[PDB]
């Protein structure tokens, strides 16, 4: 009773549920990447920063 | 336009996994669809509901747990509500330890009640106590006292105690007064020999008896301790009380809350898991009739569901050999279970319930047609249908019931048409129905007829009443004229009438089951099965036996007792006929020409066996060659079907003898038995007779019983049946399919 562009119309659904995974895995990915990012080199100023003031 | 198998269609469906759980849980409420294990390598373990079926398993042992106790208590549960509501949350798994908790609880208090008990069973001798003497359950103070006297006798005094209106012994749980003779030594060394004596012997020797008055303060602070702990007994069976209670109307929902989420994990493992997508996808049967009910259903389910997945339907022709769907209803289910018993029929074939439902009945009634059993088998069915409300809603351990009650639809029909037969038959316990309709002679003109005073030789004689007298004659309104059913002679009047009805009938369904197949062969577009098969087939069974029933007709018409001498004889005219043999003299032709007849149709029958024979081989060869097939192999399943038609027919034909020997066997039965036992009961003396008619009356209707209407019965039953299974059905009814196991809510009554 339904046709077969109403099944395409699914896939086309299945392939929205990916593309919405697909944007928040890769959104989640990046954000981690920027807190690593500042965390090492939050790490390695306040090191250096600290010893070259020690030396002044 | 034949009843025939449902349409299924096999399909794969993609349903994303939180919609998975709405949709199975759905489709298996509304029960139209089937699905296959895709994945048959994979364990449960693999399919992943390894932790929802331990679950289930757990829940369903604390809960067998618990409905155990709850019997234990006598609690009426009803469980007959929440049919509708098929919960399937996820919340129930955590809701199911609770209620574990709740019957742990359960075991704790029996763990108390029991260890309280023992308390209670033991205080109970402190009030009894208030030398040491002990308390005996008096079932052996007898010797308790004669072994103890022996221990050292006479070295102490016997202290004699009795308890009057006692509670139960702990360890027999029995009440009963107690009477003891009890010895008790101040020596250290006797002391323990009597400690060892008394112990040994079923004896309490609890307290410690003391003069001081020390001891009796004791034994009033234990009283009370005593009525305490009789106070927290009753607060924990009050407690107890009430969680079970609880628990009798938790449980009723639960028995079905948590079959059903089992159930619907075992279809969820019942799955194909895909790799692409959390995602389960899977090959699924379901009617194209329900197609529209289905995506409905899923439309609904799914709507549930958050995640709105189109859940579809995705139709795909597969050649994998559908499941054979017969739609049944309360009445010809049962019809079709005794079909199906024999086998499954093949995926559209020709259903043959429809026309069992009359044929199988009528059938039977020809062999049991007896009126007054009749009613007797009637009413035992309509009992079971009145009460069929009240058989179905309780518990039926008892498989012959169950089987009858099954059948109960069938039975009715079998006992209506019995009764039409028996009134034919004229038959009821021996005895005609004479409704004044009986003019098969006038005796009267009997005496005219140069019979004076026949009666004065015939005290030794019968003298049997003459046909075509110029005075008798005319045939009885409706069945066998009652006058034959008491002559000396009936055994080949109505001994003859059921043979030659018994090859009628049996012919014509014969007839009627080749008929069938070819709206077969029709259905299935198989030209050749009615080109080389049916028409030689049914000119085959028609110029033989259908010639033979002619004849049948023919004579009964065509001679009367004018020509009974050298009346022609249709068995030897019949096998004169298929040997050729026409003798000059020695037995008189039906009709001119009829030689001509016989040989003819003998030669055309023997003329349809190539075409059935070897026709379809041969051709199906040609075609092999102009086309561009196991010709071996083809010759040989059409040479076993010929061979085995042919033959059958021969045998087929002779099987229906079955209608007149089980109908002879109850007919003399019948009238044997009223004979040698209800007769005896009438004697020419009033009283003794009416007391006497009472008691013999009884030991007859058990007799009817226990033999006709039972045992008679179930022969003819099975016979009726087995003329389906072996004659009628294989004409048309071949092949084999699987039966359609659908997804249903079938633990209803459970």
């Given at each position: 009773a339904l046709s077969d562009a109403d099944v395409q119309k699914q896939i086309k659904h299945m392939m929205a549920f990916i593309e919405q995974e697909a944007n928040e895995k890769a959104e989640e990915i990046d954000a981690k990447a920027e807190e690593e990012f500042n965390i090492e080199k939050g790490r390695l100023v306040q090191t250096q920063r600290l010893k070259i003031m020690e030396y002044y | 336009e034949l009843f025939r198998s449902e349409e299924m269609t096999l399909a794969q469906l993609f349903l994303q996994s939180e919609a998975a759980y709405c949709c199975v849980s759905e489709l298996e409420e509304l029960g139209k669809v089937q699905f296959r294990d895709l994945n048959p390598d994979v364990n449960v373990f693999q399919r992943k509901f390894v932790n929802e079926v331990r679950r289930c398993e757990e829940m369903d042992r604390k809960l067998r747990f618990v409905e155990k106790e709850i019997r234990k208590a006598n609690i009426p549960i009803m469980d007959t509500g929440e049919n509708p509501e098929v919960p399937?949350?996820?919340?129930?798994?955590?809701?199911?330890?609770?209620?574990?908790?709740?019957?742990?609880?359960?075991?704790?208090?029996?763990?108390?009640?029991?260890?309280?008990?023992?308390n209670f069973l033991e205080l109970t001798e402190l009030k009894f106590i208030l030398f040491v003497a002990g308390v005996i359950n008096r079932e052996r103070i007898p010797t308790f006292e004669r072994m103890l006297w022996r221990v050292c006798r006479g070295n102490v005094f016997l202290r004699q105690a009795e308890i009057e209106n006692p509670l139960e012994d702990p360890v027999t749980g029995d009440y009963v007064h107690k009477s003891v003779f009890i010895i008790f030594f101040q020596g250290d060394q006797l002391k323990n020999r009597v400690k060892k004596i008394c112990e040994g012997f079923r004896a309490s020797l609890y307290p410690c008896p003391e003069t001081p008055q020390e001891r009796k303060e004791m034994a009033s602070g234990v009283n009370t301790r005593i009525d305490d702990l009789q106070m927290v007994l009753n607060q924990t069976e009050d407690h107890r009380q009430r969680v079970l209670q609880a628990a009798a109307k938790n449980i009723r929902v639960?028995?079905?809350?948590?079959?059903?989420?089992?159930?619907?994990?075992?279809?969820?493992?019942?799955?194909?898991?895909?790799?692409?997508?959390?995602?389960?996808?899977?090959?699924?049967?379901?009617?194209?009739?329900?197609?529209?009910?289905?995506?409905?259903?899923?439309?609904?389910?799914?709507?549930?569901?958050?995640?709105?997945?189109?859940?579809?339907?995705?139709?795909?022709?597969?050649?994998?050999?559908?499941?054979?769907?017969?739609k049944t209803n309360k009445f010809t289910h049962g019809f079709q279970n005794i079909v199906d018993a024999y086998g499954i029929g093949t995926y559209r074939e020709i259903n043959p319930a429809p026309y069992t439902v009359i044929t199988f009945?009528?059938?039977?009634?020809?062999?049991?047609?007896?009126?007054?059993?009749?009613?007797?088998?009637?009413?035992?069915?309509?009992?079971?249908?009145?009460?069929?409300?009240?058989?179905?809603?309780?518990?039926?351990?008892?498989?012959?019931?169950?089987?009858?009650?099954?059948?109960?639809?069938?039975?009715?029909?079998?006992?209506?048409?019995?009764?039409?037969?028996?009134?034919?038959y004229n038959d009821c316990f021996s005895k005609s129905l004479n409704i004044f309709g009986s003019s098969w002679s006038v005796r009267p003109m009997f005496t005219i007829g140069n019979w004076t005073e026949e009666t004065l030789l015939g005290s030794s004689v019968?003298?049997?009443?003459?046909?075509?007298?110029?005075?008798?004659?005319?045939?009885?309104?409706?069945?066998?004229?009652?006058?034959?059913?008491?002559a000396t002679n009936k055994l080949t009047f109505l001994n003859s009438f059921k043979m030659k009805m018994?090859?009628?009938?049996?012919?014509?369904?014969?007839?009627?089951?080749?008929?069938?197949?070819?709206?077969?062969?029709?259905?299935?577009?198989?030209?050749?099965?009615?080109?080389?098969?049916?028409?030689?087939?049914?000119i085959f069974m028609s110029s033989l036996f259908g010639y033979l029933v002619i004849l049948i007709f023919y004579k009964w018409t065509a001679y009367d007792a004018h020509s009974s001498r050298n009346a022609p004889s249709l068995l030897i005219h019949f096998i004169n006929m298929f040997l050729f043999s026409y003798p000059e003299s020695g037995n008189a032709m039906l009709y001119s020409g009829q030689k001509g007849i016989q040989c003819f149709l003998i030669v055309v029958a023997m003329l349809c066996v190539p075409w059935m024979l070897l026709f379809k081989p041969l051709i199906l060869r040609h075609q092999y060659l102009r086309k561009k097939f196991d010709f071996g192999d083809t010759m040989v399943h059409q040479a076993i079907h010929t061979i085995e038609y042919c033959l059958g027919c021969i045998s087929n034909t002779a099987s229906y003898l079955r209608l007149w020997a089980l109908s002879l066997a109850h007919a003399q039965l019948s009238e044997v038995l009223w004979t040698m036992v209800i007769h005896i009961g009438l004697?020419?003396?009033?009283?003794?007779?009416?007391?006497?008619?009472?008691?013999?009356?009884?030991?007859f209707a058990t007799l009817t019983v226990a033999i006709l209407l039972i045992m008679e019965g179930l022969s003819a039953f099975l016979h009726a049946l087995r003329l389906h299974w072996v004659e009628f059905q294989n004409k048309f009814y071949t092949g084999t399919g699987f039966k359609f196991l659908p997804f249903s809510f079938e633990h209803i009554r459970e």
């Open positions: - | 399937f949350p996820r919340d129930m798994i955590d809701l199911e330890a609770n209620f574990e908790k709740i019957e742990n609880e359960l075991k704790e208090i029996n763990t108390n009640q029991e260890a309280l008990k023992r639960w028995f079905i809350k948590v079959r059903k989420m089992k159930a619907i994990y075992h279809t969820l493992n019942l799955c194909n898991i895909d790799v692409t997508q959390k995602c389960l996808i899977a090959e699924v049967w379901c009617p194209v009739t329900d197609l529209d009910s289905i995506q409905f259903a899923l439309r609904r389910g799914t709507e549930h569901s958050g995640s709105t997945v189109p859940s579809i339907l995705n139709r795909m022709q597969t050649n994998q050999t559908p499941p054979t769907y017969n009945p009528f059938l039977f009634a020809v062999m049991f047609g007896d009126f007054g059993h009749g009613i007797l088998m009637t009413l035992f069915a309509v009992w079971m249908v009145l009460r069929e409300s009240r058989i179905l809603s309780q518990k039926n351990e008892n498989e012959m019931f169950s089987m009858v009650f099954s059948g109960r639809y069938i039975i009715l029909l079998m006992g209506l048409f019995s009764i039409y037969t028996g009134l034919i019968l003298q049997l009443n003459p046909a075509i007298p110029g005075v008798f004659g005319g045939p009885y309104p409706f069945g066998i004229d009652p006058i034959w059913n008491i018994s090859v009628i009938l049996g012919i014509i369904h014969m007839l009627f089951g080749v008929s069938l197949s070819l709206f077969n062969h029709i259905y299935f577009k198989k030209p050749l099965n009615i080109y080389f098969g049916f028409i030689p087939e049914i004697h020419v003396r009033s009283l003794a007779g009416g007391l006497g008619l009472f008691f013999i009356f009884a030991a």
